[PDB]
Amino acid sequence: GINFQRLDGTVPSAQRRISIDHFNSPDSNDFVFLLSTRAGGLGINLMTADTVVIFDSDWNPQADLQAMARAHRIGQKNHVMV
DNA sequence: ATACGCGGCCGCCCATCAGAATCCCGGTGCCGAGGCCGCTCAATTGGTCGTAGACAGCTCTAGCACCGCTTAAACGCACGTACGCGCT
Incomplete structure (x- = not known):
């Protein structure tokens, strides 16, 4: 019973x-939002997101820094937990 | 002149001696392993040298995987035409 949407x-x-x-x-009732590696860190940003859970490193340095950069931004106020 | 006798002929069942035919034992020709063999020239034996190629190190191509934007190609179905094929 978790409302979400893939990307x-x-x-x-x-x-x-x-x-x-x-x-x-x-x-919005979608507290879970799935992404990807190249498609996740492709562009745009998420302002209401704050928690970033990564299953494993995608075999690329700083790819995690740029991947969290789609949620961990300036508009976020309630910190960021990874 | 008138009546009796018979004579070989013959069907009959009944007897003797040779010939035909089946079974009990056969020789003959054809095929295929065997043996013999012997002069001998190709494999084997003992031996040296050297070189292909196994092997380990190495690096450096390209085969894999993986993803997503884009779209041509595949899909499945609807409808009918013009062939497959059956008959004569």
Whole structure:
């Protein structure tokens, strides 16, 4: 019973834009948002996200720093736990 | 002149001696392992040298994997035409 939405390199822009525009709402019930490596750190940003859980290093240095950079940003106020 | 006798002929069952035919034992020709063998020239034996190629080190291509944006190609189904194939 966890409401979420995926984000990888398969869905077009018309769908991932609706997903990201739906996640940025302050009353969104999607507390889990899945991403990827290149698609996760592809671009844009998440302001309401703060917790970044990584399963394993994606065989690239600083790829984790740039991956958390999509959530850990300036607009975040309640700190960032990784 | 008138009546009796018979004579070989013959069907009959009944007897003797040779020939035909099946079984009990056979020789003959064909095929395929054997043996013999012997002059001998190709393999084996004992031996040296050297070189291919195994092997370990190394680096440095390219085969794999993996991902996602883009889209041509595959898919499945609907409809009918023009062939497969059956008959004569």
